[PDB]
């Protein structure tokens, strides 16, 4: 089997992407944030504290003839941005882009943090990291991909995120029309439960490539590119007037600037992030100070190849017995 679904930016800055997902019988369609940096599929629901729901579409398990309470199971998750959610668990039928999994754990939110409430466009998350990170207790549950894997034509999914435009998540096949040149594959460590890999270096604009190993995660659920402070300083030094602002919470730059590109290495291959992808717009409405798309990972504890990086590539998440990651230009 295979599946193919379009993913759409939530706003004009590509702060996140949503993908429609069918849950239950009859289908209830929710728009979920596909997140290769976590491993829980959770949704706003009829059980979510009413004051914490503001415009989201909810899953109502009592209206699904295939929903079953997973008795005694609870979940609770905290994300890198400080947001969180928790609740109980149902199993139900879940379909993405024509690919169906029966008996998928659907984690129903009883509580969500303010950041979730305030984002009306995101109805929940669909985690695509390794199932070892799944938070369901006392019986850990598998991701949608893990459940689908054996049925797929090939044990892979791909992320093809758009810049200020829709893109695609495919399951079970590689669309050879979706990228240019060849796909370069690179080793993955699953030790921390992430799609963790090592970039071979970077360049700033038309500058020379610096060969240096950068360990990080491919994370579709993180907006920006978070890299070591040395790398980030080298980037922003090429932008007149750019500076790190503790009050704003990262590097800002004059909105009048033209940003240089940023290149990262994948083995001997190179992925070029155009300068415009690094512009996250005014820090507040009407400001001439703009927020940067490349930020320091210092004090995160890990480097994160988030959407800023991934949307410059066609990315293969290869879930074979020994997982790997592939990157192509597009």
Swiss-Prot record:
It catalyses: Hydrolysis of proteins with specificity similar to that of pepsin A, prefers hydrophobic residues at P1 and P1', but does not cleave 14-Ala-|-Leu-15 in the B chain of insulin or Z-Glu-Tyr. Clots milk. GO terms for molecular function: aspartic-type endopeptidase activity. Keywords: Aspartyl protease, Disulfide bond, Hydrolase, Protease, Signal, Zymogen. Its EC number is 3.4.23.22. The keyword Protease applies. Disulfide bonds join 255-290. Coiled coil: none annotated. Residues 17-328 form the Peptidase A1 domain. The active site is at 35, 199. GO terms for biological process: proteolysis. Belongs to the peptidase A1 family. This is Endothiapepsin. The gene is EAPA. The chain holds residues 90 to 419 of 419 of the full protein.
